[PDB]
Subunit: 236 residues, 5 copies
Amino acid sequence: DLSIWGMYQHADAVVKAVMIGLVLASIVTWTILFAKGSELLRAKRRLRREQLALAEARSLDEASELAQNFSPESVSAVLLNDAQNELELSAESNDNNGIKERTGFRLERRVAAYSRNMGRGNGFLATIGAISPFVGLFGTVWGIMNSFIGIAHSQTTNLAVVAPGIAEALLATAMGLVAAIPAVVIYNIFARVISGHRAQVGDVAAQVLLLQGRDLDLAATAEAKRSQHAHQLRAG
Amino acid sequence: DLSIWGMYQHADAVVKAVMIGLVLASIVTWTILFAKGSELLRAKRRLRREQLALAEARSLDEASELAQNFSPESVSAVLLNDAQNELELSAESNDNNGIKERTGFRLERRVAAYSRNMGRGNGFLATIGAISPFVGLFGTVWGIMNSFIGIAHSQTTNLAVVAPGIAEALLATAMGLVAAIPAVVIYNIFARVISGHRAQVGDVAAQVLLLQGRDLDLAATAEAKRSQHAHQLRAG
Amino acid sequence: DLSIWGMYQHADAVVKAVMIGLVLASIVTWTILFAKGSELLRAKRRLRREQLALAEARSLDEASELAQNFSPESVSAVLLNDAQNELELSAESNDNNGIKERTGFRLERRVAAYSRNMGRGNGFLATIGAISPFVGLFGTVWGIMNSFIGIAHSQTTNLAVVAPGIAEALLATAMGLVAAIPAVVIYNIFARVISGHRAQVGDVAAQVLLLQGRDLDLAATAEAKRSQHAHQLRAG
Amino acid sequence: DLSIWGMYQHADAVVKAVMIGLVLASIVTWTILFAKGSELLRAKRRLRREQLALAEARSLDEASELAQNFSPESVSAVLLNDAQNELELSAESNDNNGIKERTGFRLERRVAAYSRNMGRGNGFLATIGAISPFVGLFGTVWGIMNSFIGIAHSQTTNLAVVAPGIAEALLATAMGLVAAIPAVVIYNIFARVISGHRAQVGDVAAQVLLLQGRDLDLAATAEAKRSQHAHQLRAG
Amino acid sequence: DLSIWGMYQHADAVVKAVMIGLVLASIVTWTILFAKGSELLRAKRRLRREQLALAEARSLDEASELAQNFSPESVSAVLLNDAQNELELSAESNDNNGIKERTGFRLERRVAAYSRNMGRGNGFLATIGAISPFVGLFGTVWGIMNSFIGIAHSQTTNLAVVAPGIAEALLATAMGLVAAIPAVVIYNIFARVISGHRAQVGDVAAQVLLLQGRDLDLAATAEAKRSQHAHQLRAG
């Protein structure tokens, strides 16, 4: 009558509350894994295809033309629209260093927002893996405390009577560790994957800033080369 | 006579001091939650309305006109007044890169001050969730130490006499964990929410710096275009 | 004979050394509090008065005139002398962006030095609150180890003889926690206050950099406006 | 029958699963050491030879000529090709500050990628050294819990029967510490070595940015000196 | 026969290996202290003398003349040679902002290298203070595990026989704490001192960058003032 289910239904009210809290923490842990690791791996494999497509680009217009047929909910099309949007909001503004600083500002704001939305379940995983051995420890401290209350109320010296109480308490601490260890492991995996992915988003943003800077620079050079002849037709 | 209230009033002076200290830590924990989480959520929903209002702005003057009817104790009106204030303190100063660097300096100072005032109760929550299992542990170490003193003073070997002492001690450590676990959980929640909100404040500050930079840039361009005709009337 | 003083004088040599080490850690903890929290609060209330005085300044010369009557060992007068000192070391240097970058460099060096001298006792508080439960744990491990040596040397089975040994050991671990918990609490308080104060010092430094930048900018503008007439009298 | 192998085969199903999980964590620990510490030391000794070769360089063309005969899978040739590649992508772009900012951008992206690929096994080592005492602790908690279930099912008071159960449990926690301690030690070693190596990669990148900046600067100076004679033939 | 040396020679093979590993960790701890704290304090007192000598400098040439008679293995002479070396490598390069950015780049690379070579033993101290209570804990877990094996092999119920086993185990954990606590204390001391010293090296580097920037600025100004007369003799 002392199986893993046997011990749970033979437990106290507070110990059962601790145990179903730890089981719900485990359900949330594995659900965060199978429902956001799937989205993370899908987004990694999507940005890899977009990164390989835009890796042959030589201007921002070729990158926008290659990004016309990307996914609707992508990243590279969002960053390319920010760069191009800034180029049209700052049209009839001749300060190209301004456009570069403002685009770098919008893209680091956008990359920061994207990377923040990536790690949503990380707070849950960090809190579960941090507090779950304490919730299991509270379960076993309450179990042993009720065992000592049961040994003080009734003058009973032997341990074969108070042993299922100690076993239920220890079950609560074991379940605490079972809810804790995938929390930390999955958190670590996610941290690695998310850093990989935020390096990819930073790489695509880098690419957009280098294609916009190179275009602005080359355009400014051609314009200068044509305007020198006008300068020497005006100052003469 | 050994209920949760029964054990407290049957405890020592130091153990009762530990227990009411942990209960006051729990009262402060839940009061920080229900009285600053309310202010944080109110400020989040207020900056969201102001962010949606100013998201259609094309200059700093349209943003100031849309922000004239904002809340008195807002953020977006404060940041917009810093930007506009700098524009009038640095009137008759032709260095526009200067105004942009000084406004970015004032706004990062203001955003830093606002974000510092946001996390006020965080020090309390971090200290309570860090030291509360130690205060519970001091309570149980003193409980077992007084139990061993009671077992050394009177030659009493059985455990049915010294068991309420050990139970009171264990109550102190359980209460330590109950004061500890919402401290860490609420700290984590608050950290997430506060990062969300400090990203929103950073976004509004970003917007103000991009509307002021774009205006200064466009103005400098128009002024330059008009002064070229004066240049060719002066240098001829 | 087993009071808190009774147990100490009835202890071993190593256990008494652990206990007076923990009492000296507690004396240092409360002395760091009452002798540097007083200096921190005095400096906070002094920089608040200087911040309110200089908040009505419109140039660096008005700020220096208002800071002539400040405290000798202040901060705002030191930072204002750095700014003004740089303005006279870089006299007959026409590069104003140079003066701004060099002043920002000296002031961040000075602010860093001031903020480093602020947190002096923080290393003591962090080390005491980190190692003090370990020193208490070493005391109780040596106490129980000597208790087991005493139970192995003399074939004595009952616990009413070996109980004051275990109580002295547990006293060492309780004293470890008492020396540990104000170390962490006071460290946290100090960290908060010191961040508050280093934000104030950063605000005053910010003010000095914005008053020096605005003055240099406005001066450069007036000089340019006067030199344009000389330019058009020279190039004609 | 209670040797280290004797205890394992006499254990439970969950305790044996814990033990082979800890042995596989130890195999992965020592394999990460002997198969990536070898690659790290090989890469350190290779970048040292390339650093000594390029330390006598005075331009980017001499560094490229000395790097023609480097290893195929090197670092210095990759960074030198980025610098030279940027110099040819931004050919017919006269903004040299642009080329310097874009090269610094590509090289910090490349250095970041290289340093990220260096620390691959670090996530494994950090997770193993963090969760391995907990997996050993889960093993011993399950061992003692099954021991108490065995002492509650059969009314058996003496400890000479339940002692191999407690010994198997303790074996699981010792094995937990054995899988944990080389995880942290090797992680620390690797962290040191990887910081050493990422300082070397940062030094080579620094060198490439200083050779490209000095060349661009010196070229711009010579070009300016020749164009001054053309200026006085155009403005005359 | 149960003195501190008595217990060690009466121990197991694994427990003696744990104990001599902890004694060698203690020897390394105190040797890192007395052989690198001496070098740190010598370097602190040497940079203080050089800082007081160069604090009266008004150019980089006066600082080089005052640094000609410094120690051979110093810091200030190294940083001053970097600044002067850059000034001669970038001779016949008129871009002074270039020289300032490249010198700041070399000096932050050099300061980073010096500060990295300062904290050599820090990895040893951090690893010893982190893993040493675990190595002591492995020693006591193996000691109690062998005690339970000895109580399971021979049906022996009393504790006066198994007590030296538990005492040897506890000795291993006490020695673990003795090797651990100076590791953390000395690490903390070193961290403080090294931050003090890396602030001094940063201050000297700051000084070198401010003396080189001021010299370049003042030179550029004088050159401009002389070249204006040539400009008005050329453009006339």
